Design a protein around this ligand. Structure first.
Ligand SMILES: CCCCC/C=C/C/C=C\CCCCCCCC(=O)O[C@H](COC(=O)CCCCCCCCCCCCCCC)COP(=O)([O-])OCC[N+](C)(C)C
Ligand SMILES: CCCCC/C=C/C/C=C\CCCCCCCC(=O)O[C@H](COC(=O)CCCCCCCCCCCCCCC)COP(=O)([O-])OCC[N+](C)(C)C
Ligand SMILES: CCCCC/C=C\C/C=C/CCCCCCCC(=O)O[C@H](COC(=O)CCCCCCCCCCCCCCC)COP(=O)([O-])OCC[N+](C)(C)C
Ligand SMILES: CCCCCCCCCCCC(=O)OC[C@H](COP(=O)(O)OCC[N+](C)(C)C)OC(=O)CCCCCCCCCCC
Ligand SMILES: CCCCCCCCCCCC(=O)OC[C@H](COP(=O)(O)OCC[N+](C)(C)C)OC(=O)CCCCCCCCCCC
Ligand SMILES: CCCCCCCCCCCC(=O)OC[C@H](COP(=O)(O)OCC[N+](C)(C)C)OC(=O)CCCCCCCCCCC
Ligand SMILES: CCCCCCCCCCCC(=O)OC[C@H](COP(=O)(O)OCC[N+](C)(C)C)OC(=O)CCCCCCCCCCC
Ligand SMILES: CCCCCCCCCCCC(=O)OC[C@H](COP(=O)(O)OCC[N+](C)(C)C)OC(=O)CCCCCCCCCCC
Ligand SMILES: CCCCCCCCCCCC(=O)OC[C@H](COP(=O)(O)OCC[N+](C)(C)C)OC(=O)CCCCCCCCCCC
Ligand SMILES: CCCCCCCCCCCC(=O)OC[C@H](COP(=O)(O)OCC[N+](C)(C)C)OC(=O)CCCCCCCCCCC
Ligand SMILES: CCCCCCCCCCCC(=O)OC[C@H](COP(=O)(O)OCC[N+](C)(C)C)OC(=O)CCCCCCCCCCC
Ligand SMILES: *[C@@H]1O[C@H](CO)[C@@H](O[C@@H]2O[C@H](CO)[C@@H](O)[C@H](O)[C@H]2NC(C)=O)[C@H](O)[C@H]1NC(C)=O
Ligand SMILES: *[C@@H]1O[C@H](CO)[C@@H](O[C@@H]2O[C@H](CO)[C@@H](O)[C@H](O)[C@H]2NC(C)=O)[C@H](O)[C@H]1NC(C)=O
Ligand SMILES: CC(C)CCC[C@@H](C)[C@H]1CC[C@H]2[C@@H]3CC=C4C[C@@H](O)CC[C@]4(C)[C@H]3CC[C@]12C
Ligand SMILES: CC(C)CCC[C@@H](C)[C@H]1CC[C@H]2[C@@H]3CC=C4C[C@@H](O)CC[C@]4(C)[C@H]3CC[C@]12C
Ligand SMILES: CC(C)CCC[C@@H](C)[C@H]1CC[C@H]2[C@@H]3CC=C4C[C@@H](O)CC[C@]4(C)[C@H]3CC[C@]12C
Lengths: 399, 399
C-alpha cells in the first residue's frame, strides 16, 4: 500500500488451491465471479467442507455408539480451553475481516468523492463558460456596437470559451463509475454488517454453550448435559458451515488478489478507456498523463481569455463609462475558472486514485484474507472443541 | 478519515481526567509535551496507579495473613477464566494499538513522500530552467549573431525562464519538515515494535503462569504452587505497571486528540508558513490556495516561452538550417516543464495532505486510543485474576 501491490504468500498459496468444478473437471482459476465454471469450483470447495462435516458427524455417532454399547474432567477442561482459544481467534479474525471490509468501503468512498468532484468541476466550468460568458459577452456586444476591434475581441473570447468547452467535454464522464462505486459500497456495508453480527452471535453462542456445559458438569445435571450435547451438535453444524464459507471466500479473494489489475481492466472495459484505467492503475512516474494535453489547452485558453479581457478593460473602460461591470464579471469568472482548473488538474492526477486503489487492495487482500483465514481457524477449532466435548459426553454420563 | 475530524466521546472523556501534578496544584490540560507542568501531570497519573498497586498488595498480604492465622476449585477456574479473558482483551488491544501506530507511520510516510516530491519537482525545474535553458539560449545566440529580432526573442525567453525560477523559489521548502517526518516515523516504528513485543511477552507469560498453576494444582505439587504464587505476584506488579503506562498514554493521547490542529499550528510556527499550514490542515474548497498565483505565473511563463519557441522554429528553420536541434531541445525541455507543472499543482493541492493528516488523526485517536483502553482493561483484568489466584492459593496449600 506504500509503493505497489505484490501478492502475499498466503494469497499465492490460496490461489494455488486446485479449482475442480462439481464433476472433478479442471476449472480455470482466474477470478470470474460471473462465470458458471468458477462459481461451480467455489461450490465444490463448499461441498468438500460439507463432506468433511458429514465425516465428523459419522465419526461422532460411531464413537457414541461404541462407548454406550461397549479423564472426563480433564477432557472437559481441554475442550473448554480449545473453545476459548477458538473464540479468541474468531474475535480476532472477525475484527480483521471487518477492518478489511471497512478499508475497501473507505477506498470506494474516496474514489467516489474524487470522481464526483471531477464531474462537478467539469459540469460547473462548462455551464459557467457557456451560459455566463455568453450572457456577459452579449451584453458587452450590445453596449459596444460601435467598435469593430472590440467586437472582434469579444468574438475571440467566445471562440476561446468554445475551445474550453470542447476540451472539457473531451474528459471522461464518471457518472456510471460513480453509481457503480456507490452501489458496491452500499452492498459491502450491508453484507459486512450482517457477517460481523452473525460471527459475533456465533462466538457468544459458543461461549455460552461451553460455560453451560461446564456448569452442568459441575452440578451433575443430566438435563444440562443433554441440552449442551444438543447445542454442541448444532454449533458443530454451524462451525462446519462457517468453515465452508470462509474457505470458499478465501479462495475467491485469493483468486482476485493474485491479479487485481487484470480483473479491473477486464470488468471496466467499455465504460472506461484503457489508457485512463491504466493511468490510474499503474501511476508510473515516468509516464504521460492522458489529460495533460486537455489541461494544457484549457489553461492556454483561459490565459488568452484573461489577456483579452484585461486589454479590453484597460482600453475601453476609460472610453466607455459603463460596461465595466460586465468586464469585471468576466474577469471574476475567469479567476474562478483558473481556480477550478487547478483543482481539476489536482483531482485527475493518478496519485490519489492509485492510492485509493492500493488501499483497497491492501484492505481486501491483507486484512480481509487474513481475517477469513482466522475465521476458518476459529471454525476448525470450534469443530474440534465441540467434537471432543461430545466424545467425552458418554464418559461423563457414566461417571 | 472518511469525513472531517471530530473528537470522539472517549477522547473527550479522557481529556476531562483532571491534571494535578505532584503537589496537586491545578495543571493546564492542553497538550504541551515539552512542558514540566504537563509532564508532572502525567507522572501523577502514573503515581495514582502505583498507589493503587501498593494498596492491592497491602490487601493481598492482609488477607493472606488472616487466612493463614485463622471453593478452591471453583475460585481457581474463575481465576483461569478471567486470565484467559484478560489475555484475549490484551491481544485485541495490542493488535489495535499496533494498527494505530502503523497507520500513523503510513500517514507520516505518505506526507514525507509528497513533500519530498514537491521539493524534487521544484529543484529539478529550477535547475533545468537555469542551467539547460541558459546554455541552449547561449548557443542559439551565438548561432544567431545576425538578427536583432531573434536576439530579442532569446532575451525574452531568458527573462521568462528567470521569472519561472523566481516563482519556483517562492514556494515552501520541505527539507526540514521532511527530516522531522522521517525522524518521527522511525521513532514511532521503534517504540511501537518494542511495545508490541513487550505486551505479547506479557500475554504469553500470563498464559503460561495460569496453565502451569492449573497443572501444579492437578499434580498436587507444593513447589509448583509456590512458584505460581511468586510468578502471579510478579505478573500483578507488571499488570499494575502496564495499567499506569496505559492510563498515562491514553490521557496524553486524548489531550492531543482534543486539539490536534492547535498543537500542529503551535509546533510548526517557525518552520512552516501559517497560511500554508492552515491550507493543508483545513482543506476547504471555499477558500483559495496559497500557491494559485505562483502556479498561474509559472504556467503563463511556460506558455509564453512555448509560443516564442514555436515562432522561432517556424520563422527560422528555413532561414537557418542549423539551430533546429537546439530549438527542438528547448521545446522538449518546456514540454517536460509543463508536465512537471501539472505534477506540482497536483502535489501541492491540499486534498492529499489533508487526507494524510486526517488518516493519522483517525489512526492515533480512534485506533490507538481504543487499543490503549483495551490494554488498560487487560491490565486490570490480569490484576484481578492474579489477586484472586493468590487469595485462593492458601486454601489449596492447606488442602
Ligand atoms: C459464501 C462463500 C463465497 C462463495 C460462495 C459460493 C459461490 C457459488 C454459490 C452459488 C452460485 C450459483 C451456482 C450456479 C452455477 C453452478 C455451477 C454450474 O452450473 O455447473 C454445473 C453444476 O451442476 C449443477 O447442478 C448446476 C448448478 C447447480 C446450482 C446449485 C445451487 C446450490 C446453492 C447452495 C449454495 C448456498 C450458498 C450460495 C447461495 C447462492 C456443472 O454441470 P454438472 O457437472 O453437474 O452436469 C453433469 C451432467 N452429466 C452427469 C450427465 C454429465
Ligand atoms: C455460520 C456463520 C456464517 C456467517 C456468514 C454467513 C451469514 C450471512 C452473511 C451475509 C448474508 C447476506 C445478507 C443477508 C441477505 C440479504 C439478501 C436480501 O434480502 O436481498 C437484498 C439484497 O442485499 C444486497 O444488496 C446484497 C446482496 C447479498 C447477496 C449475497 C449472497 C452471498 C453472500 C456471500 C458472503 C461472503 C462473505 C462471507 C465470508 C465469511 C437485501 O436488502 P437490500 O440490499 O436491497 O436493502 C439495502 C440496499 N443496500 C444493500 C444497497 C443498502
Ligand atoms: C500528514 C502529516 C502526518 C500526520 C500529522 C498528524 C499528527 C502528526 C504527529 C502528531 C503527534 C506528534 C507527537 C510529538 C511528541 C513530541 C513533541 C516534542 O517534544 O517536540 C515537538 C516537535 O516534534 C514534533 O512535534 C514532530 C512534528 C511532526 C509534524 C511535522 C509537520 C507535519 C504537518 C506539516 C504541515 C501541514 C499541516 C498538516 C497536514 C499535513 C515540539 O513540541 P513541544 O511543545 O513539546 O516543544 C515546544 C517547542 N515549540 C514551541 C517550538 C513547538
Ligand atoms: C455446508 C455447505 C453446504 C453447501 C454445499 C453445496 C455442495 C454442492 C451441492 C450440489 C453438489 C452435488 O449435489 O453433488 C454432485 C456431485 C456429483 O458429481 P460426480 O462426482 O462427478 O458423479 C458423477 C461422476 N461423473 C460426473 C464423472 C460421471 O458430487 C460428487 O459426487 C462429487 C464426488 C467427488 C467427491 C470428492 C470429495 C473429496 C473430499 C476429500 C475430503 C478431504
Ligand atoms: C446448516 C447451515 C447453518 C448456517 C445457516 C446460516 C444462515 C443461512 C441463511 C440465513 C439468512 C436467510 O434467511 O437466508 C437468506 C439468504 C439470502 O438468500 P434469499 O433467501 O434467497 O434472499 C433473497 C430472496 N428473498 C428476498 C425472497 C428472501 O441466504 C443466504 O445468503 C445465507 C447463506 C448462508 C451460507 C452458509 C454456508 C455457505 C457455504 C458456501 C459454500 C460455497
Ligand atoms: C482506480 C482504478 C480505476 C477504478 C475504476 C473503477 C472500478 C470500479 C470497480 C467496479 C467493480 C464491479 O463492477 O462490481 C464488482 C463485480 C460485481 O460482481 P459480478 O456481477 O459478478 O461481476 C461482473 C461480471 N460481469 C461483468 C461479466 C457481469 O465483482 C465483484 O463484486 C468483486 C469486486 C472486487 C472489488 C473491486 C474493488 C477494487 C478496489 C477499487 C478501489 C478504487
Ligand atoms: C495453533 C492453534 C491456533 C493458534 C491460534 C493463535 C495463533 C494463530 C497463528 C498465529 C501466527 C500467525 O500470525 O501467522 C502469521 C500468518 C501470516 O501473517 P504474517 O505474519 O504477517 O506474514 C509473515 C510471513 N513471513 C513470516 C514470511 C514474513 O497469518 C496468517 O496468514 C493467518 C494464519 C492462520 C491460518 C489458519 C489456516 C486457516 C485455514 C482455513 C481456510 C483454508
Ligand atoms: C504507540 C506509540 C505512539 C507514538 C509514541 C511516540 C513516543 C515518543 C515520540 C517522541 C519521543 C521523543 O522525542 O522523546 C523526547 C521527548 C522530548 O525530547 P527532549 O529533547 O528531551 O526535549 C527537551 C525537554 N523539554 C522539552 C522539557 C525541554 O521526551 C518527552 O517528551 C517525554 C514525555 C513524552 C511522552 C508523551 C509524549 C507523546 C505522547 C503520545 C501523544 C500522541
Ligand atoms: C508514567 C508511569 C509509567 C509507569 C512505568 C511504565 C514504563 C515506563 C518506561 C520507561 C522506559 C525506560 O525507563 O527506559 C528504557 C530502558 C532504558 O534503556 P537503556 O538502558 O538506557 O538502553 C541502553 C542504551 N542503548 C539503547 C544505546 C543500548 O530500557 C530497558 O532496558 C528497560 C526495559 C524494561 C522493560 C520492563 C519494564 C519493567 C517495569 C517494572 C515496573 C514494576
Ligand atoms: C477470549 C475472549 C476474547 C474477547 C475479546 C473481546 C474483543 C472485543 C471486540 C469488540 C469490538 C467492539 O465491540 O467495538 C469496540 C467499540 C466500538 O468502536 P468502533 O466501532 O471501532 O468505532 C467507534 C464507534 N463508536 C463511536 C460508536 C464507539 O469501541 C469503543 O466503543 C470504545 C470503548 C473502549 C472500551 C475499553 C474499555 C474501557 C474501560 C477500561 C479503561 C481503562
Ligand atoms: C491455552 C492455549 C492458548 C493459546 C493462545 C495462543 C496465543 C499466542 C499468540 C501467538 C501468535 C503471535 O505470534 O502473534 C499473535 C497473533 C498474530 O498477531 P498479528 O496479526 O500478526 O500482529 C501483527 C504485529 N506485527 C505486525 C508487529 C507482527 O494474534 C492472534 O493470532 C490472535 C490470537 C487470539 C488469542 C488466542 C488465545 C486467547 C485466549 C486464550 C485462552 C486459552
Ligand atoms: C458517491 O458520490 C455520489 C455523487 O456523485 C453521491 O450521490 C449523492 O448522494 C447524496 C447524499 O445521499 C444525494 O443528495 C445526491 O443526490 C447524490 N447524487 C447523485 C448524483 O446521485 C453518493 O452518496 C456517494 N456515495 C457514497 C457511498 O459515498
Ligand atoms: C522521507 O523522504 C526522504 C526524502 O526526502 C527519504 O530520505 C531518503 O532516503 C533514501 C533511502 O534511505 C536515501 O537514499 C536518500 O538519500 C534520502 N534522501 C534524503 C534527502 O535524505 C526518507 O527515507 C523518507 N523517510 C521515510 C520514513 O520514508
Ligand atoms: C495457510 C494459508 C494462509 C494458505 C492455505 C493453506 C492450505 C489450506 C493450502 C495452501 C496450498 C494448498 C496446496 C496447494 C497445492 C496442492 C497440490 C494439489 O495437487 C493437491 C492439493 C495441494 C496439496 C493444496 C492443499 C491445500 C493447501 C496446502
Ligand atoms: C481452503 C480449503 C477449503 C481448501 C481445500 C482443498 C481441497 C478442496 C482440494 C485440495 C486437494 C484437492 C484434490 C487434488 C487432486 C485431485 C485429483 C483429481 O483427479 C480429482 C480432484 C482431486 C481429488 C482434488 C479435489 C479437491 C482437493 C481435495
Ligand atoms: C474511554 C473512557 C471513558 C474510559 C474510562 C475513563 C474514566 C475512568 C474517566 C473518564 C472521565 C473521568 C472523570 C472526569 C471528571 C471527573 C471530575 C473530578 O472532580 C473527579 C474525577 C472525575 C469523576 C473523572 C474520573 C475518571 C473518569 C470517569
Amino acid at each position: 500500500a506504500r509503493v505497489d501491490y505484490i501478492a502475499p504468500w498466503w494469497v499465492v498459496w490460496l490461489h494455488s488451491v486446485p479449482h475442480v468444478g462439481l464433476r472433478l473437471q479442471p476449472v480455470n482459476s482466474t477470478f470470474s465471479p460471473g462465470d458458471e465454471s468458477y462459481q461451480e469450483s467455489l461450490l465444490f470447495l463448499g461441498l468438500v467442507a460439507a463432506v468433511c462435516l458429514g465425516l465428523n458427524l459419522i465419526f461422532l455417532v460411531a464413537y457414541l455408539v461404541c462407548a454406550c454399547h461397549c479423564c472426563i474432567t480433564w477432557t472437559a477442561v481441554v475442550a473448554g480451553l480449545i473453545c476459548c482459544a477458538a473464540v479468541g481467534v474468531g474475535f480476532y479474525g472477525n475484527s480483521e475481516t471487518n477492518d478489511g471490509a471497512y478499508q475497501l468501503m473507505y477506498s470506494l468512498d474516496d474514489a467516489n468523492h474524487t470522481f464526483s468532484g471531477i464531474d462537478a468541476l467539469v459540469s460547473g466550468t462548462t455551464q459557467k463558460m457557456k451560459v455566463d460568458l455568453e450572457q456577459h459577452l452579449a451584453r458587452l456586444s450590445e453596449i459596444f456596437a460601435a467598435r469593430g476591434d472590440y467586437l472582434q475581441t469579444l468574438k475571440f473570447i467566445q471562440q476561446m470559451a468554445g475551445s474550453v468547452v470542447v476540451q472539457l467535454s473531451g474528459l471522461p464522464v464518471w457518472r456510471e463509475v460513480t453509481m457503480e462505486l456507490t452501489k458496491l459500497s452500499d452492498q459491502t456495508g450491508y453484507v459486512e454488517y450482517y457477517r460481523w453480527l452473525s460471527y459475533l452471535l456465533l462466538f457468544i453462542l459458543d461461549l455460552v454453550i461451553c460455560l453451560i456445559a461446564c456448569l452442568g458438569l459441575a452440578k451433575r445435571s443430566k438435563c444440562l448435559l443433554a441440552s449442551m450435547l444438543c447445542c454442541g451438535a448444532l454449533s458443530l453444524l454451524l462451525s462446519w458451515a462457517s468453515l465452508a464459507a470462509d474457505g470458499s471466500a478465501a479462495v475467491a479473494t485469493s483468486d482476485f488478489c493474485v491479479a487485481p489489475d487484470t480483473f479491473i481492466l477486464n470488468v471496466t472495459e467499455g465504460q472506461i478507456s484503457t489508457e485512463v484505467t491504466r493511468y490510474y492503475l499503474y501511476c508510473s512516474q515516468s509516464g504521460s498523463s492522458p489529460f495533460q494535453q486537455t489541461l494544457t489547452t484549457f489553461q492556454r485558453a483561459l490565459t488568452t481569455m484573461q489577456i483579452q479581457v484585461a486589454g479590453l478593460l484597460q482600453f475601453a473602460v476609460p472610453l466607455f463609462s459603463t460596461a465595466e461591470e460586465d468586464l469585471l464579471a468576466i474577469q471574476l469568472l475567469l479567476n474562478s475558472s483558473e481556480s477550478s482548473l487547478h483543482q481539476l488538474t489536482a483531482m485527475v492526477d493518478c496519485r490519489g486514485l492509485h492510492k485509493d486503489y492500493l488501499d483497497a487492495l491492501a484492505g481486501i487482500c491483507y486484512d480481509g484474507l487474513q481475517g477469513l483465514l482466522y475465521l476458518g481457524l476459529f471454525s476448525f477449532l470450534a469443530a474440534l472443541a465441540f467434537s471432543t466435548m461430545i466424545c467425552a459426553g458418554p464418559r461423563a454420563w457414566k461417571h
